[PDB]
Amino acid sequence: IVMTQPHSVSESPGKTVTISCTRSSGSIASNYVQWYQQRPGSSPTTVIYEDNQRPSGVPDRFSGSIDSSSNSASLTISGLKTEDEADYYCQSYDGSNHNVVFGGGTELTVLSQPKAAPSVTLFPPSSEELQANKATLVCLISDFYPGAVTVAWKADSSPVKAGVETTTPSKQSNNKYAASSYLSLTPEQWKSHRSYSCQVTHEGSTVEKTVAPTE
Amino acid sequence: TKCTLKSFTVEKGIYQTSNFRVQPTESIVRFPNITNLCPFGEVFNATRFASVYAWNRKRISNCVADYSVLYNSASFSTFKCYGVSPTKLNDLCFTNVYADSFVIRGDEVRQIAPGQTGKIADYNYKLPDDFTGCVIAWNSNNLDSKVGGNYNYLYRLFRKSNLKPFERDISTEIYQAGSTPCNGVEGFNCYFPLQSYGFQPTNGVGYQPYRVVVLSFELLHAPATVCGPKKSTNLVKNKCVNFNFNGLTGTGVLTESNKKFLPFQQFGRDIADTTDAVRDPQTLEILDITPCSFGGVSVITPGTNTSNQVAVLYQGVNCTEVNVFQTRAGCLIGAEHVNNSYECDIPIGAGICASYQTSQSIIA
Amino acid sequence: EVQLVQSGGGLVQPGGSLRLSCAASGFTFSSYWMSWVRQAPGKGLEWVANINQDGGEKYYVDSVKGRFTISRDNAKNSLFLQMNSVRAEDTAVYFCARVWYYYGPRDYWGQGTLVTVSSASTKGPSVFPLAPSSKSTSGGTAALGCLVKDYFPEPVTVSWNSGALTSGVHTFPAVLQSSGLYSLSSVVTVPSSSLGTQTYICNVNHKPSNTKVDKRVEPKSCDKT
Ligand SMILES: *[C@@H]1O[C@H](CO)[C@@H](O)[C@H](O)[C@H]1NC(C)=O
Ligand SMILES: *[C@@H]1O[C@H](CO)[C@@H](O)[C@H](O)[C@H]1NC(C)=O
Ligand SMILES: *[C@@H]1O[C@H](CO)[C@@H](O)[C@H](O)[C@H]1NC(C)=O
């Protein structure tokens, strides 16, 4: 048994966008359905419980219904503003073996920053770290609103992806991100490739920049 | 005093100004031990059920139906209500409770609901639209795993007439496909209105004993006969409060007493037919009742011509429920008690008089 | 009115474990159930286990069945959760929350306990700058920063000259490589006007060790700019 839930969703302040939570087995009208909200950096809180009803304190804009068509549920969150941009989870007691199953979460955000193409800035290794065999590859990009960073790596002759790993972006001052990448290197095989290009297709151009291994 | 006498210059004497009264601060509600619990235990773990269509109804009478045992257990599997709010069932009184119960499988739990009709909408027990109640269906696979698959709870299927809200589909009429009636045993397009149980323990997960006890509610003009228990506060003494005992309701202090009531005697009254003694509902202790302190306020003034400082005389009140000097007629606040005896100038009561002498201050 | 607190762990290790204690206060801790729910970093929520009123039943999940011990003392109004043989996937923040009723939600949650499993204990690493030479002096957004690699704890707050060469710093958290390798890197924006004017000296703020070595960056002013 698992609770399906969309990963992310984004829109502008305006109409409502409901969040779906489809089950896998059993009936949805056999137990209650609760919706929790977990603010980033604090403890979760209950928003709506027993979706047909709503508790006090929380504004009545947060509404939810029950869809017994395919054992799913919906949380029609109305009044999309800045004080509601957070995460939400799904929960429903289904396990007959005394097991409380939870959802997957969501990434409901808003739209306030304009569209801008991220700059391509590749940083070659240095000499201080290059004592015997040690270096990194920094292709940090900035000035981009969407957090779905999609970059690529190629040493001018092959899309090297061994040990692919990206850097988690952080919230900048005016609602920006600094998602970077950190690909694994070759300590004793620096002479195999004398160039390294960093491609990026994060909703924009595809210009790549090359550097020198050690000079 | 000037406002009550309607003047600006008053002479010596004791004038009546107003009438003060102490108000009750808190409230105490006392109810005895919660006895006469409703026998809701036998409704869940008991002998087998008659049949699916032949479900048994158990009405409810005057009792104490506590709900803290239904939604606080783990033996059940489904607790989905339809507008009941079990968190407030302890503060809601009903009159008609329907304790329907029968035997189904795991796959038939979904078909029994006001929001999902079908096989159990015209062939077995049906549910109304409103249906103020909660469905209670638990997995009964603990000991209902007998061999052979005993089919005794035969549910009547393929019935023409639709079933009514809170009724039984008892009709010994063979299934006719649209031809001449056979009036026998599976004749010309005939089928006996019975279906076979037999959900053996080695049959499947969906085919298992799932005895469900359907529960609903209904309000009528009759007085509330079935309802949950009530709350009770802590006992407080030596304070003007507003007691809310089982039958009595009023204000006054609640201290201890030496009176002894008879076993059956609960209340207590005086000669003037006024309540003066009460018995504790929870424990066995006779609590005395005494009305709170009241009375008028009087001022002792030496005349606005000589001076302007005055005193107050709370008549009849003790000095703990209000310099201070307990007299035999109240608490003279604003005067000193001198031992030297002089002539009475301003009468106060019980011999005590006041005067404006020497540094000048009101003496008593 | 209900304000729950919990603590009793800052760092664990494989084999050696501890016992989480959830102090119950404010409400009446005699008519409510208790259950633990953990949250993994970058994941959702997971139900750990449940517990009865005082000693009725201790429902466990099939994942941690046999290596977790839950308890509850109704007399002193406390909730104890002792661990044993901590696995690798148990790195998650645990939350304490009371149960209104067995078929309802959780009214009040706890505060969170940072219980993580990490080897490669406290040591002194080195910092390596970026030295933007090839395609960062004039191509794109000119910037530069530092890089802290292979450091066990996470107290580092990378600054620039202790508040003397700050022009806008956007530092992002690091990431675990295999089991104890963390690669932290900071970045500051440069107007592309002081590359060959003042040499940059990045400073680290490691609390356990003393990473006060300001590694000199080498701006290749003769290659591109
Ligand atoms: C039957 O169920 C009730 C639940 O209300 C439980 O209290 C009781 O212990 C069970 N057993 C018997 C023999 O009543
Ligand atoms: C039942 O009554 C006795 C008699 O005083 C009392 O001591 C006891 O506390 C009562 N029980 C409850 C649960 O109130
Ligand atoms: C007034 O209250 C005091 C304080 O408890 C008490 O000693 C006294 O008996 C009461 N009555 C009078 C007339 O003072």
Coordinates of N, CA, C and O in Angstrom, one line a residue, chain A residues 31-32 34 36 38 42-46 48-50 89 91 93 97-105 119-130 134-136 138 140 142-143 165-174 176 178-180 182 209-212 214-215, chain C residues 35 37 39 43-47 50 57 59-62 95 100-107 109-112 127-136 139-144 146-147 149 170-177 183-185 187 215-218 220 223-224:
Chain A
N31 N -12.2 5.1 5.8 CA -11.5 5.7 6.9 C -11.4 7.2 6.5 O -11.7 7.7 5.4
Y32 N -11.0 8.0 7.5 CA -10.9 9.4 7.3 C -9.6 9.8 6.5 O -8.7 9.0 6.4
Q34 N -6.7 13.0 6.3 CA -6.2 14.2 6.9 C -5.1 14.8 6.0 O -4.5 14.1 5.2
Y36 N -1.8 17.4 6.4 CA -0.9 18.1 7.3 C -0.1 19.1 6.4 O 0.1 18.9 5.2
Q38 N 3.7 21.1 6.6 CA 5.1 21.1 7.3 C 5.8 22.3 6.7 O 6.3 22.3 5.6
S42 N 10.5 23.8 10.7 CA 9.7 23.8 11.9 C 9.0 22.4 12.0 O 9.2 21.5 11.2
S43 N 8.0 22.3 12.9 CA 7.2 21.1 13.1 C 5.9 21.2 12.2 O 5.4 22.3 12.0
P44 N 5.4 20.0 11.8 CA 4.2 20.0 11.0 C 3.0 20.4 11.8 O 3.0 20.4 13.0
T45 N 1.9 20.8 11.1 CA 0.7 21.2 11.7 C -0.5 20.7 10.9 O -0.4 20.5 9.7
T46 N -1.6 20.4 11.6 CA -2.8 19.9 11.0 C -3.6 21.1 10.4 O -3.9 22.0 11.1
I48 N -6.5 20.5 7.7 CA -7.9 19.9 7.5 C -7.9 18.5 8.0 O -7.0 17.7 7.6
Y49 N -8.8 18.1 8.8 CA -9.1 16.7 9.2 C -10.5 16.4 9.0 O -11.4 17.3 9.3
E50 N -10.8 15.2 8.6 CA -12.2 14.8 8.3 C -12.8 15.7 7.2 O -13.7 16.5 7.4
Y89 N 1.0 17.2 3.0 CA 1.2 15.7 2.9 C -0.2 15.1 3.0 O -1.2 15.7 3.4
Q91 N -2.5 11.6 4.3 CA -2.5 10.6 5.4 C -3.9 10.0 5.5 O -4.9 10.7 5.4
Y93 N -5.6 6.2 7.4 CA -5.4 4.9 8.0 C -6.0 3.8 7.2 O -7.2 3.7 7.0
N97 N -3.0 -4.0 9.7 CA -2.0 -4.5 10.7 C -1.5 -3.4 11.6 O -0.4 -3.4 12.1
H98 N -2.4 -2.4 11.9 CA -2.0 -1.2 12.7 C -0.8 -0.4 12.2 O 0.2 -0.3 12.8
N99 N -1.0 0.0 10.9 CA 0.0 0.8 10.2 C -0.6 2.1 9.7 O -1.6 2.0 9.0
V100 N 0.0 3.2 10.0 CA -0.5 4.5 9.5 C 0.4 4.9 8.3 O 1.6 5.1 8.4
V101 N -0.3 4.9 7.1 CA 0.4 5.3 5.9 C 0.3 6.7 5.6 O -0.8 7.4 5.8
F102 N 1.4 7.3 5.1 CA 1.4 8.7 4.8 C 1.7 8.9 3.3 O 1.9 8.0 2.6
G103 N 1.6 10.2 2.8 CA 1.7 10.5 1.4 C 3.2 10.7 1.0 O 4.1 10.1 1.6
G104 N 3.4 11.5 0.0 CA 4.7 11.7 -0.5 C 5.2 13.2 -0.3 O 6.3 13.4 -0.2
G105 N 4.2 14.1 -0.4 CA 4.5 15.5 -0.3 C 4.3 16.3 -1.6 O 4.0 15.7 -2.6
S119 N 23.0 32.2 -16.4 CA 24.3 32.3 -17.0 C 25.1 31.1 -16.8 O 25.0 30.3 -15.8
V120 N 26.0 30.8 -17.7 CA 26.9 29.7 -17.7 C 28.3 30.1 -17.2 O 29.0 30.8 -18.0
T121 N 28.6 29.7 -16.0 CA 29.9 30.1 -15.4 C 30.6 28.8 -14.9 O 30.2 28.2 -13.9
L122 N 31.6 28.4 -15.7 CA 32.4 27.2 -15.3 C 33.7 27.7 -14.6 O 34.3 28.6 -15.0
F123 N 34.1 26.9 -13.6 CA 35.3 27.3 -12.8 C 36.3 26.1 -12.9 O 36.0 25.0 -12.5
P124 N 37.5 26.4 -13.5 CA 38.5 25.3 -13.6 C 39.2 25.1 -12.3 O 39.1 25.9 -11.4
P125 N 39.9 23.9 -12.1 CA 40.6 23.7 -10.9 C 41.7 24.7 -10.7 O 42.0 25.5 -11.5
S126 N 42.4 24.6 -9.5 CA 43.5 25.5 -9.1 C 44.7 24.6 -8.9 O 44.8 23.4 -9.2
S127 N 45.8 25.3 -8.5 CA 47.1 24.7 -8.3 C 47.3 24.3 -6.8 O 48.1 23.3 -6.6
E128 N 46.8 25.0 -5.9 CA 47.0 24.7 -4.4 C 46.4 23.3 -4.1 O 47.0 22.5 -3.4
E129 N 45.1 23.1 -4.6 CA 44.5 21.8 -4.4 C 45.2 20.7 -5.2 O 45.2 19.5 -4.9
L130 N 45.8 21.1 -6.4 CA 46.4 20.1 -7.3 C 47.9 19.9 -6.8 O 48.8 20.2 -7.5
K134 N 44.1 16.1 -6.6 CA 42.9 16.6 -5.9 C 42.4 17.8 -6.6 O 43.1 18.8 -6.8
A135 N 41.1 17.8 -7.0 CA 40.5 18.9 -7.7 C 39.0 18.7 -7.7 O 38.5 17.6 -7.4
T136 N 38.3 19.7 -8.1 CA 36.8 19.6 -8.3 C 36.4 20.4 -9.5 O 37.2 21.1 -10.1
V138 N 33.4 23.0 -10.8 CA 32.3 23.9 -10.4 C 31.7 24.5 -11.6 O 32.4 25.3 -12.3
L140 N 28.7 26.3 -11.3 CA 27.6 27.0 -10.6 C 26.9 28.0 -11.5 O 27.6 28.8 -12.2
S142 N 23.5 30.8 -11.9 CA 22.7 31.7 -11.1 C 21.7 32.4 -11.9 O 21.6 32.2 -13.2
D143 N 20.9 33.3 -11.3 CA 19.8 34.1 -12.0 C 18.9 33.2 -12.8 O 18.7 33.2 -14.0
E165 N 26.5 14.1 -9.5 CA 25.9 14.7 -8.2 C 25.8 16.2 -8.4 O 26.7 16.9 -8.9
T166 N 24.6 16.7 -8.0 CA 24.3 18.1 -8.1 C 24.3 18.8 -6.7 O 24.1 18.1 -5.7
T167 N 24.4 20.1 -6.7 CA 24.4 20.8 -5.4 C 23.0 21.4 -5.2 O 22.3 21.9 -6.1
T168 N 22.5 21.2 -3.9 CA 21.2 21.7 -3.5 C 21.2 23.2 -3.5 O 22.0 23.8 -2.7
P169 N 20.3 23.9 -4.2 CA 20.2 25.3 -4.1 C 19.6 25.8 -2.8 O 18.8 25.1 -2.2
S170 N 20.0 27.1 -2.5 CA 19.4 27.7 -1.3 C 18.7 29.0 -1.7 O 18.9 29.6 -2.7
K171 N 17.8 29.4 -0.8 CA 17.0 30.6 -1.0 C 17.9 31.8 -0.9 O 18.4 32.1 0.2
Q172 N 18.0 32.6 -2.0 CA 18.8 33.8 -2.0 C 17.9 34.9 -1.4 O 16.9 34.7 -0.9
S173 N 18.4 36.2 -1.6 CA 17.7 37.3 -1.0 C 16.4 37.6 -1.7 O 15.3 37.5 -1.1
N174 N 16.4 37.9 -3.0 CA 15.2 38.2 -3.8 C 14.6 36.9 -4.4 O 14.3 36.9 -5.6
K176 N 15.8 33.7 -5.2 CA 16.6 33.1 -6.3 C 17.2 31.8 -5.8 O 16.9 31.3 -4.7
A178 N 20.8 28.9 -6.3 CA 22.2 28.8 -6.6 C 22.6 27.3 -6.8 O 23.6 26.8 -6.3
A179 N 21.7 26.6 -7.6 CA 22.0 25.2 -7.9 C 23.2 25.0 -8.7 O 23.3 25.5 -9.8
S180 N 24.2 24.2 -8.2 CA 25.4 23.9 -8.8 C 25.5 22.4 -9.1 O 24.6 21.7 -8.7
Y182 N 28.5 18.9 -9.0 CA 29.7 18.4 -8.6 C 29.9 17.0 -9.1 O 29.4 16.0 -8.6
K209 N 31.1 25.8 -22.2 CA 32.4 26.4 -22.0 C 33.4 25.3 -21.6 O 33.2 24.4 -20.8
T210 N 34.6 25.5 -22.2 CA 35.7 24.5 -22.0 C 36.8 25.2 -21.2 O 37.0 26.4 -21.2
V211 N 37.6 24.3 -20.5 CA 38.7 24.8 -19.7 C 39.9 23.8 -19.9 O 39.8 22.9 -20.8
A212 N 41.0 24.1 -19.2 CA 42.2 23.3 -19.3 C 42.4 22.5 -18.1 O 42.1 22.9 -17.0
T214 N 45.2 21.1 -16.2 CA 46.2 21.5 -15.2 C 47.0 22.7 -15.7 O 47.5 23.4 -14.8
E215 N 47.1 22.9 -17.0 CA 48.0 23.9 -17.6 C 49.5 23.7 -17.0 O 49.9 24.4 -16.1
Chain C
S35 N 2.3 8.1 19.5 CA 2.9 7.4 18.4 C 4.1 8.3 17.9 O 4.0 9.5 18.1
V37 N 6.6 9.5 14.7 CA 6.7 9.7 13.3 C 8.0 10.4 13.0 O 8.3 11.5 13.5
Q39 N 11.0 11.8 10.1 CA 11.1 12.5 8.8 C 12.5 12.4 8.3 O 13.4 13.0 8.9
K43 N 12.8 13.8 2.2 CA 11.8 12.8 2.0 C 10.5 13.2 2.7 O 10.3 14.3 3.1
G44 N 9.5 12.3 2.8 CA 8.2 12.6 3.4 C 8.2 12.2 4.9 O 9.1 12.5 5.6
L45 N 7.1 11.6 5.3 CA 6.9 11.2 6.7 C 6.7 9.7 6.8 O 6.2 9.0 5.9
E46 N 7.2 9.1 7.9 CA 7.2 7.6 8.1 C 6.7 7.4 9.5 O 7.2 8.0 10.5
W47 N 5.7 6.5 9.6 CA 5.2 6.1 10.9 C 6.1 5.1 11.6 O 6.3 4.0 11.1
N50 N 3.6 2.8 17.6 CA 2.5 3.3 18.4 C 2.7 2.8 19.8 O 3.5 1.9 20.1
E57 N -0.7 -2.2 24.6 CA -0.1 -2.8 23.4 C 1.0 -1.9 22.8 O 0.8 -0.6 23.0
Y59 N 2.4 -1.4 19.3 CA 2.4 -1.8 17.9 C 3.6 -1.3 17.2 O 3.9 -0.1 17.2
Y60 N 4.3 -2.2 16.5 CA 5.5 -1.8 15.7 C 5.2 -2.0 14.2 O 4.3 -2.8 13.8
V61 N 6.1 -1.4 13.4 CA 6.0 -1.6 12.0 C 7.0 -2.7 11.6 O 8.0 -3.0 12.3
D62 N 6.7 -3.4 10.5 CA 7.6 -4.5 10.1 C 9.0 -4.1 9.7 O 9.8 -5.0 9.5
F95 N 9.8 12.9 15.5 CA 8.8 13.8 16.1 C 7.9 13.1 17.1 O 7.6 12.0 16.9
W100 N -5.2 12.2 19.3 CA -6.5 12.6 19.9 C -7.4 11.3 20.0 O -8.0 11.1 21.1
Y101 N -7.5 10.5 19.0 CA -8.2 9.2 19.1 C -7.6 8.4 18.0 O -7.1 8.8 17.0
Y102 N -7.7 7.0 18.2 CA -7.0 6.1 17.3 C -7.4 6.2 15.8 O -6.6 5.8 15.0
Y103 N -8.5 6.8 15.5 CA -8.9 7.0 14.1 C -8.9 8.5 13.7 O -9.6 8.9 12.8
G104 N -8.0 9.3 14.4 CA -8.0 10.7 14.1 C -6.5 11.2 13.9 O -5.6 10.4 13.9
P105 N -6.4 12.5 13.7 CA -5.0 13.0 13.4 C -4.3 13.3 14.7 O -4.8 13.0 15.8
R106 N -3.1 13.9 14.6 CA -2.3 14.3 15.7 C -2.5 15.8 16.0 O -2.4 16.6 15.1
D107 N -2.8 16.1 17.3 CA -3.2 17.5 17.7 C -1.9 18.3 17.7 O -1.8 19.3 17.0
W109 N 2.4 18.4 17.7 CA 3.6 17.8 17.4 C 4.7 18.3 18.3 O 4.6 19.3 19.0
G110 N 5.9 17.6 18.2 CA 7.0 18.0 19.0 C 7.8 19.1 18.4 O 7.3 20.1 17.9
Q111 N 9.2 19.0 18.5 CA 10.1 20.0 18.0 C 11.2 19.4 17.1 O 11.8 20.2 16.3
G112 N 11.4 18.1 17.1 CA 12.4 17.5 16.3 C 13.7 17.2 17.0 O 14.2 18.0 17.8
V127 N 40.8 24.1 3.0 CA 39.9 24.8 2.1 C 40.7 25.1 0.9 O 41.9 25.4 0.9
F128 N 40.0 25.0 -0.3 CA 40.6 25.3 -1.6 C 39.7 26.3 -2.3 O 38.5 26.1 -2.5
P129 N 40.3 27.4 -2.8 CA 39.5 28.4 -3.5 C 39.2 28.0 -4.9 O 39.6 26.9 -5.4
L130 N 38.6 28.8 -5.7 CA 38.2 28.5 -7.1 C 39.2 29.1 -8.1 O 39.4 28.4 -9.1
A131 N 39.7 30.3 -7.9 CA 40.6 31.0 -8.8 C 40.0 31.1 -10.2 O 40.5 30.4 -11.1
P132 N 39.0 31.9 -10.4 CA 38.4 32.0 -11.7 C 39.3 32.6 -12.8 O 39.6 33.8 -12.8
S133 N 39.8 31.7 -13.6 CA 40.8 32.1 -14.7 C 40.3 31.9 -16.1 O 40.4 32.8 -16.9
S134 N 39.7 30.8 -16.4 CA 39.5 30.4 -17.8 C 38.3 31.1 -18.4 O 38.5 31.8 -19.4
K135 N 37.1 30.8 -17.9 CA 35.9 31.3 -18.5 C 35.0 31.9 -17.5 O 33.8 31.7 -17.5
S136 N 35.6 32.7 -16.5 CA 34.8 33.3 -15.5 C 35.3 34.7 -15.2 O 34.7 35.4 -14.4
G139 N 33.5 36.0 -19.2 CA 32.3 35.2 -19.7 C 31.3 34.9 -18.6 O 31.6 34.1 -17.7
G140 N 30.1 35.4 -18.8 CA 29.1 35.2 -17.8 C 29.2 36.0 -16.6 O 29.8 37.1 -16.6
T141 N 28.6 35.6 -15.5 CA 28.6 36.3 -14.2 C 29.9 35.9 -13.5 O 30.2 34.8 -13.1
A142 N 30.8 36.9 -13.4 CA 32.1 36.8 -12.7 C 31.9 36.6 -11.2 O 31.2 37.4 -10.6
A143 N 32.4 35.5 -10.7 CA 32.3 35.2 -9.3 C 33.4 34.4 -8.8 O 34.2 33.8 -9.6
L144 N 33.6 34.2 -7.5 CA 34.6 33.4 -6.9 C 34.2 33.0 -5.5 O 33.3 33.7 -4.9
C146 N 35.1 29.7 -2.1 CA 35.9 28.7 -1.5 C 35.3 27.3 -1.5 O 34.3 27.1 -2.2
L147 N 35.9 26.4 -0.9 CA 35.5 25.0 -0.9 C 36.0 24.3 0.4 O 37.2 24.1 0.5
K149 N 35.9 20.7 2.2 CA 35.7 19.3 1.9 C 36.1 18.4 3.0 O 37.1 18.7 3.7
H170 N 25.9 34.3 -1.2 CA 24.8 33.3 -1.3 C 25.4 31.9 -1.1 O 25.7 31.2 -2.0
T171 N 25.4 31.5 0.2 CA 26.0 30.2 0.6 C 24.9 29.2 0.6 O 23.8 29.4 1.2
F172 N 25.1 28.0 0.0 CA 24.2 26.9 0.0 C 24.7 25.7 0.8 O 25.9 25.6 0.9
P173 N 23.8 24.9 1.4 CA 24.3 23.8 2.2 C 25.1 22.8 1.4 O 25.0 22.8 0.2
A174 N 25.8 21.9 2.1 CA 26.6 20.9 1.5 C 25.8 19.6 1.3 O 24.6 19.6 1.4
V175 N 26.5 18.5 0.9 CA 25.8 17.3 0.6 C 26.8 16.1 1.0 O 28.0 16.3 0.8
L176 N 26.3 15.1 1.5 CA 27.1 13.9 1.9 C 27.4 13.1 0.7 O 26.6 12.8 -0.2
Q177 N 28.7 12.8 0.5 CA 29.2 12.1 -0.7 C 28.9 10.6 -0.6 O 28.1 10.0 -1.3
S183 N 31.0 18.3 1.2 CA 31.7 19.3 0.4 C 30.9 20.6 0.4 O 29.9 20.8 -0.3
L184 N 31.4 21.5 1.3 CA 30.7 22.8 1.4 C 31.5 23.9 0.5 O 32.7 23.8 0.5
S185 N 30.8 24.7 -0.1 CA 31.4 25.7 -1.0 C 30.5 27.0 -0.9 O 29.3 26.9 -1.0
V187 N 30.1 31.2 -2.4 CA 30.3 32.0 -3.6 C 29.9 33.5 -3.3 O 28.9 33.8 -2.6
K215 N 43.6 30.3 3.0 CA 44.4 29.9 1.9 C 44.4 30.9 0.8 O 43.4 31.4 0.4
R216 N 45.6 31.3 0.3 CA 45.7 32.3 -0.7 C 45.2 31.8 -2.0 O 45.6 30.8 -2.5
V217 N 44.4 32.6 -2.7 CA 43.9 32.3 -4.0 C 44.9 32.9 -5.0 O 45.6 33.8 -4.7
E218 N 45.0 32.2 -6.2 CA 46.0 32.6 -7.2 C 45.2 33.1 -8.4 O 44.9 32.3 -9.3
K220 N 45.0 34.1 -11.9 CA 45.8 34.0 -13.1 C 45.6 35.3 -14.0 O 44.8 35.3 -15.0
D223 N 46.8 34.9 -17.8 CA 46.2 34.0 -18.8 C 45.1 34.8 -19.5 O 45.2 34.9 -20.7
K224 N 44.0 35.2 -18.8 CA 42.9 35.8 -19.4 C 42.7 37.2 -19.0 O 42.6 38.2 -19.8

